[PDB]
Amino acid sequence: MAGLGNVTGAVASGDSLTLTLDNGTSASDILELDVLSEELLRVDYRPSGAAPSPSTPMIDPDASWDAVGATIDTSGDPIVVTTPRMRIEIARTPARMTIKKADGTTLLWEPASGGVFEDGVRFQRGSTDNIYGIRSFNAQEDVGGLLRNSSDHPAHAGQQGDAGGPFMWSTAGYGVLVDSDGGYPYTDTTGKLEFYYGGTPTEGRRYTKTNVEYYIMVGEPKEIMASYAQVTGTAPMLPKWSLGFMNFEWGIDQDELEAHVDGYRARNIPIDAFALDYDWMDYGEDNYGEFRWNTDNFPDAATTQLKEDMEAEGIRLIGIRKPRIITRDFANQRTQQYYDADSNGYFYPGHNEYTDYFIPVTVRSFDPYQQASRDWWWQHSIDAFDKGIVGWWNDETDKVDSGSAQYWFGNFSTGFTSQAMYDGQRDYTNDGVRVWQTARSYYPGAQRYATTLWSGDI
Amino acid sequence: MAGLGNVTGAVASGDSLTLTLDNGTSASDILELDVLSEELLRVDYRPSGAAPSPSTPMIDPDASWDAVGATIDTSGDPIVVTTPRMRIEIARTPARMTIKKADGTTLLWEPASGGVFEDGVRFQRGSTDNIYGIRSFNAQEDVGGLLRNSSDHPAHAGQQGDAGGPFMWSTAGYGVLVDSDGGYPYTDTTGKLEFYYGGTPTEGRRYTKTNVEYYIMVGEPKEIMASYAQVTGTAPMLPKWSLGFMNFEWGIDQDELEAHVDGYRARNIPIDAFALDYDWMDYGEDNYGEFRWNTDNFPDAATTQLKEDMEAEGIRLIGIRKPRIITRDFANQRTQQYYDADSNGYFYPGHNEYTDYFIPVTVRSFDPYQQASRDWWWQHSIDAFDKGIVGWWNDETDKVDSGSAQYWFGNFSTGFTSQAMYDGQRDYTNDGVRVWQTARSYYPGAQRYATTLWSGDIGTQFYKGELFNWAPGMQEQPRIMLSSANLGQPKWGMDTGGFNSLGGASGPNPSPELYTRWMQFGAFTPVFRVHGNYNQQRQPWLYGATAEEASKAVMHTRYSLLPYMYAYEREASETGLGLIKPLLFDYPNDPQAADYTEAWMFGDWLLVSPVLGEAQHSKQIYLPAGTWIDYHRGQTYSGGQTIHYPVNADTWTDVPLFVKQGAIIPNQQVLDYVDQQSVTTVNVDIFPSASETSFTYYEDDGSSYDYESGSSFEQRLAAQDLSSSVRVEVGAGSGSYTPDVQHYVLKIHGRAGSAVTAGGSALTGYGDLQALQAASGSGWASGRDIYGDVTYVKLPAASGSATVVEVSGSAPSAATHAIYEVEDASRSGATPTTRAGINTNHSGYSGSGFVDKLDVPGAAVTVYANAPVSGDYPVELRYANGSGSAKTLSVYVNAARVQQLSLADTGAWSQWGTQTTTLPLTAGQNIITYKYDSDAGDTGGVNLDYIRVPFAPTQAEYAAESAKLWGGAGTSQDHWFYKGAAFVDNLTGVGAEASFDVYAPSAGTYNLSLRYANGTGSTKTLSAIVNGGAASTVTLTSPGMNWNLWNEHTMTATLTAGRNTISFRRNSGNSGNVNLDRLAVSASAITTLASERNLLDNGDFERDTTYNSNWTQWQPSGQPSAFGIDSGNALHPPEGPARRNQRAYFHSDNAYQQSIHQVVDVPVNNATYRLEAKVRMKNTTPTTARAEVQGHGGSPIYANISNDGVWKTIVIDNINVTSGSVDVGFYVDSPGYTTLHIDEVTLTRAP
């Protein structure tokens, strides 16, 4: 894909330079450079002078900088921008940027092969430089190091503790930040440092851009990171209590929470905060149950009394939130939540509704191979039989498939589960009531114990 | 792979033919043939004539055939069996069967290359015959046809509608059926028809067969199927209603059932049955819920009424059954089902507990990207906010993973979800309450909406693949943290202790070790939190006393660092930089920082390297450029090196933390929570460097966005080491917030001045820190601490003008002890209202008071005291006993009970005395606790003024296992009676050594004593090397062939002031082959260390269970052992050890006796000994449960164990030993379900 062509125009104005580039058409390309600070450059490439697209939410919309008083010399080849901290050269024919430190040290450059183009950025640098940023690792991945010297991993938020973005920097003295909704950073040990928009990523793309808006940082790591925060935003200060210890919990009610807090306080073990999982809310219920306190678990959250008692014992409460709503109550009735969201168009584009589970149980497979086991299994079924269960729908006599639990039942498990009910009911009714059963597997011999076969979850 | 041999014998007998086959050996193979019907042959091949194994349940146990009257002609070759329907030929050499129709048409045969053998059957048939059977297809499989002409699929029951079995037959006129539990049938289009047992199939194999038992059928398909059913069984007739239509339904009550039957019957649409799913039963509940009618859904199932009413409408009822039980109620208590199943052995073998669900819900993702969607979301959150939810734990903003639902959220969903809560909460409270959130992804920009990042559903293990490979563990986390910081999101935390385990939520909690180390780690990360899985508990007291105390301890450090930390929260609002950073931020040019993650910076001025290794005895810590001071031990290390750093694997007390030259660290008294009270004095520890360093102290409301419009306080603090003075510049106050800090107490380390100026006025000097803190108005003092010389300077904070402070001169303190005022220490007890107290209501006390209310069981005070090296420290306790008599209190050090103190009457409550006790301290932080341990026989009921801790020990110790090992030297637990967590072996090759770093106060001769074992039978040698000087020989005699025997080698060494190296090495002239345990060091004669009083081996049961110990066990003949050793972390909630990581247990579900025993020869005969132990018992009261002392020359002594559910201490004093031995033991006699925990067993010489 081609590099920019020759500079035909060069309008300096204050801290900004505006390059017109030949693309062999009557709609020339525009490269706007902007010196935001002594150590931070904004480059906006606009194919054919097209207007720029809106910046993504990466960019802090309220960001602004003091004037710099850069020096912009369009007199010769190359064009030259200067601050006390950095020297930018743009060679005219073809247009190729070189970034240098104030003292002349070359940091990175757009190779003769080509740098910026309509689908992203391409730089070259010291091959031995150490690169950082791009990505982190999630709770399901092999966990690497900090270095990003041979990276093709995409730039994304990811999942399960991951983090990432179009941000690639080096301890050799420079950073590159590209405004993008996802995309494909590339580095290698020949010294490439590149970023492509590419096709629609896995996670989708809701902000598409026609231009390429990027930022060059110059400095030591702390300066680079400060500049990153100027562009994408500083962090608001969090409550001070957030420096304290927090106990998160799932499977908790008001009495257990009070007993916990008393436990930490009795021992002079400091703690500022409890965080609560589903237990705190009426998840599953109508009338915005996923937003509302579960007063069965937390009686005093009927009012503000729970907040205020915990506040008096030095405890803040945190509550879990899921970016979704329940669209059917336990009864199968459509929820108020559903109607309000459907009618205003609040569902995530492309996400249909789906069945999820949320109240766990703990179970453990029984063993039907043992006579004594079978006697026991039957014995505890008599009451259900007397009271109307006369057919035995024996489900899941085959395989457990639940998280890390992938247990198989053996080949005679159907036969033996069937035997339990057969021998049992035949004895208990003096052979007076015929057995009916069904199961979703079959192995030879199982037919002796009065069972049919059904073809499973089709 | 080989086939049968030659026939050597053929015995006809009715319808049976028994053939003996040559295998070359005295035990010939046997092949019995049985004509069961005119069209059915049984074959049993028995290798070496062995008895046949029992047939599997495939075979009908009651099968029965009339006599056939077959014709067996053994008179020639082949042998020939005949019926009207088939003709079976067996060639004699080698034995090979051919099966034919009675008309002589060939059907199938065993090829020359081989037929029946040890593991199966192999036939050949017409290549174009069509084969059927073997298998069907499940509800997750590509579904093929009927034909099985090229089949390798296993024979199995399968899942989800599958069927299968060792049964292969053809329309060409034959079938084959093998009795097997699984196996591998094989067909191909060259005409093979084979079956192999093979190896254990995916489904398991519980019926093994040494023989091969098969059946050959002959006929058209109907006859083959009827023969299949004569062998495996016919089907009993089902009720006639079974031919009717049945409606199965999940999500159904009695009302809907009755409406459905009405609808069918009104329309004359026939139907015979409803089948009910979960709705029918109380699945989830105790007392056999999964077998009992749910009368909320089906009220008239309380009696036979529902049954009889449905009968009368012509409906039969069918109910779903799963072959499993609920082992937990909602309240996470064990169910009656569980207890009956566990106790009688009814669970499927190899299937542990696991997590299921059964009530689905229907949901759909909201879109945070729309402003109007955000407003809506917020509006509905307001009520939960007013009622206590002030932080937003925004989970699952990344990806859906639910069966067919695999939806991704976009890159800005976490930013936008945070935006919703941020913009909303701010507008709603008029910028009055700050926003806290956390999410599990991050993408640039998200930080503008006030959110942290946590590292998701990580694993409860030490590293990826320790227990399972599908999530990372603790050791990977630093890498995730620092990777996040490299992306501009340094407000990072993790689920300390981990979330996931094998089994899901019913899976194990962290080991105490893992828990402890993870808490120490998390305390030096930005967002500090525990979080377990469903119904799990992460409270530190649940993981045993070490975990509690070590976590508490590191927690106190964190909270003392509140003002250090909070300046970095403000920094993140200016530049985005936070509380942590990787070293490469400070060291961009250093290759050894480039990928460094085992250590990082906490603020600007502390480098931390947590102990994350299991059973770790030492760390290799890279320190980059500068001069670092050990935060806890006091020693300096020069930068630009990888240090060897000894850690005490027994206490878990160490958190390696180093102070960076130039450090300026404001700290405060420990609070239970951040705004518990106002803090008026802030301490500033200052470690001056030659270049000016600064730290800007910062205060604000901690609550609101007032800081945004100037409403905050800051004061620049700066320091420099000059030629002959230290300069500290306290800048003027800045900003409109009126801080709470009124005075700074500067603690300027490295110089003890003779003068301290401020604006060209010498400041008033005071005799010590205590008097300086009592004075209003400025002052200075000097002293000594763990770091060495220190000058204290107390000034007003928040002056309108700068103040320069200059410390000049050098006049070191002669103080021999640190002093800890216990009223400033940590106070606790059994409840919030029953803790130890502060008072000033009796005279004669030091400091601002003393500690009272040690007069309700479990009240205690705990001091954190830094020691420079491990060893003996006589620690002085200043107390008041105005009671009338001697009171008792326990002194625990590092969670081990060191002594019961007898504290004499001192005359009155305003008269004070001193008791001095020799404590076993470890290098770095120690946890010294004075407690009313009612459960250990203490009385309580004194008042405590302070303790005093010598700066230097009377004698020092160095663990060998923590020393620097090289040349093959390693650590080990595979011999008995070592000290600490291990010992050093493999001093075998030349070069092998262990190298101790030994600290001396002054240059001199010092005594050494080296504990070693030599089990070789003869004398052996090592070399000693002091400060890389000349080798001296170390000659090590052998007490005999026993490696469980340890001697002292005593010698002297000349040392310098500070760090010395002393190696014990096999140089080439030495023989090596000895074990080293510990190096003791003193200016005096070396005596018995406080840490080594215990005469038992493995008395704390901490040894890794792979390695045995001097403990033996007994149970009555034929009863399973009830005895084990583990951590109690598989239980929910955890039932931890008394100390460290493990404890013994006695348990059985059924009636049982059990004992453990240990016999030790005592060092000194005709003297008095003492047995101490922690014991905890629960559930069923046993007939008998005691510690047992006997064999000592007097009669058996006992101490009974009381059924309390809590840790008690059991003491047997005054064991007068005259036998040379003691036998200590524990014995239980239970009717079942008695669980006893035993721990921290010590046999000591009794004063």
Ligand SMILES: [Ca+2]
């Ligand atoms: Ca005191």
Ligand SMILES: [Ca+2]
């Ligand atoms: Ca040792």
Ligand SMILES: [Ca+2]
């Ligand atoms: Ca223990």
Ligand SMILES: [Mg+2]
């Ligand atoms: Mg500007």
Ligand SMILES: [Mg+2]
């Ligand atoms: Mg494009």
Ligand SMILES: [Mg+2]
């Ligand atoms: Mg409710």
Ligand SMILES: [Mg+2]
């Ligand atoms: Mg017969």
Ligand SMILES: [Mg+2]
């Ligand atoms: Mg075999």
Ligand SMILES: [Mg+2]
């Ligand atoms: Mg009716």
Ligand SMILES: [Mg+2]
């Ligand atoms: Mg009920």
Ligand code: NI
């Ligand atoms: Ni990723």
Ligand code: NI
């Ligand atoms: Ni299959």
Ligand SMILES: [Tb+3]
């Ligand atoms: Tb709980």
Ligand SMILES: [Tb+3]
């Ligand atoms: Tb229904």
Ligand SMILES: [Tb+3]
């Ligand atoms: Tb059990």
Ligand SMILES: [Tb+3]
């Ligand atoms: Tb600052």
